[PDB]
Amino acid sequence: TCPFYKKIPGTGFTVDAFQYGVVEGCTAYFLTHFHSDHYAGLSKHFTFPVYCSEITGNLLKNKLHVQEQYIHPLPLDTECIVNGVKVVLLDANHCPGAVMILFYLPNGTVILHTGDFRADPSMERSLLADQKVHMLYLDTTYCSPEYTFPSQQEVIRFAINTAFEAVTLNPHALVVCGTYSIGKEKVFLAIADVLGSKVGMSQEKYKTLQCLNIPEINSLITTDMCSSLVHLLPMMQINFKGLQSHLKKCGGKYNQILAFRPTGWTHSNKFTRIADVIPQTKGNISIYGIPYSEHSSYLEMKRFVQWLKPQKIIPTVNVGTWKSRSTMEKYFREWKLEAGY
């Protein structure tokens, strides 16, 4: 059964609630982004209206074969009327096509559902600036002060510099980047751009990338692995055994692999700066874990919430334990007392 924090009161609406069968009283199903914990349950047999971004709708139609007549893509930053209720979709600074959703309830309540997001000051100048928000349904993935990580820009600088150094020292090195979902495309696109290569990948991953409206993409990606010196592989194969095996398959074109695993946070964040990151090495293979996050840090999250000044917060992540729930509630109270709302 659908949990309360996926239901929007005073509407017929649910958010990211496709794995519960037919939800009692739901007249429209919203999907914030195409990640499997959120789309779980959609297919060609789904016959209710799905509301989402244009990019999410491309992925629904092509990857899950949902029928066109049930996909309702909406433009961003535009007031739209859905089953008699005004809504707006805003960029969530998560993966491609990810949105936050503002609902203007008929009784005057305004609700923001962040979906998954990486808070940014740029959000303080969207259509959020223009009115009061009563209730916030918040992505609390990293809601604890130990979660610090660098900007995306610093992490991409590290990766480009690392890859360009290695391949310039050894023109026979291969770069490999791990992936298991959409998001984090900048990592592999930035490295391929500095090396003057396309990124090579499986037909299934190429298909997924062609649904994303990224400009000049035919220029950056390919399925011809032989023509590429940056390869994308499943995240599970980014280990010494999986990479040794891949190197065998390249037929003596390469004699070294430099591989990247973009993770979210790991505890090496608490001690080490990005500058200082080192790989694990075995023989002619090196693996770098880089902290490229598409979720808010604790400090980014706090700044957003203290700016927005909601009257009530409903966490959507880490809600399954009493210790997590109590921790989060304590931070929300600190933030409110410090800012004075």
Ligand code: NI
């Ligand atoms: Ni996500």
